[PDB]
Amino acid sequence: NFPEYELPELNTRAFHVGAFGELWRGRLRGAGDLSLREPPAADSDREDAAVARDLDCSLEAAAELRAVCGLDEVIPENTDLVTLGVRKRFLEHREETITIDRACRQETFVYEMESHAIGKKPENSADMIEEGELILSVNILYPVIFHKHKEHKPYQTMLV
DNA sequence: CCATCAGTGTACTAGGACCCGAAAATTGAGTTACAGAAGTAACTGGTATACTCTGGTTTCTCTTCA
């Protein structure tokens, strides 16, 4: 069944997870969007033929699209935008209020827990997961260990 | 040079009042009984602080004997 907001922005209606995964794998069935492969002049011609086949255009038009839509750090930042200006001001104020300016232990902790296993390939390739496996991001609320854990409920999230 | 030892830069508590909304509960009117208790709303004595002549007083010349 379709997941839809039961509450405006807090909660969905009860829906079967298997049905939802099947809807998704049905709408992406054999479209090449669920690959789980790593990202890889002769290929240019095949790509242009594919674009001509999928967009009903000419090989010349496909090559033109491939050329024009091409992709289009350095800490210096000038000629700012709104949020870029806010970031510049924040950076300058931090440069004068802080003396060591390195990632706090909680920042590195949250990051190194989040990005602990990303792109980690299976050693066996027999425990490789199938294309389309519906990872659920549960988060289990810690019990009330400290008294203040009633106010702001700490949780640990698991990618089931 | 590897010991030691403040500071530091933060999310994570610790008290510490305080607030926001929801849900339950009450209040309120309407009736009609019921008995009795509050709850004012009414006339009717009762005794004191001024008060107003008044009864006595007081010299002060005189009245009446003596």
Tab-separated table of C-alpha atoms (C1' of nucleotides) in Angstrom, chain B residues 2 10 14-15 35 37 43 48 50-51 56 59 62:
chain	number	residue	atom	x	y	z
B	2	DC	C1'	58.113	10.618	27.949
B	10	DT	C1'	31.841	21.113	22.393
B	14	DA	C1'	21.484	18.925	35.763
B	15	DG	C1'	18.256	21.844	38.149
B	35	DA	C1'	-37.895	19.377	54.999
B	37	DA	C1'	-31.580	25.745	57.680
B	43	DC	C1'	-40.522	47.696	64.094
B	48	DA	C1'	-27.139	57.366	79.176
B	50	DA	C1'	-26.045	67.134	77.798
B	51	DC	C1'	-29.345	70.535	79.656
B	56	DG	C1'	-30.024	76.903	97.966
B	59	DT	C1'	-22.853	88.530	101.840
B	62	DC	C1'	-31.228	96.577	107.089
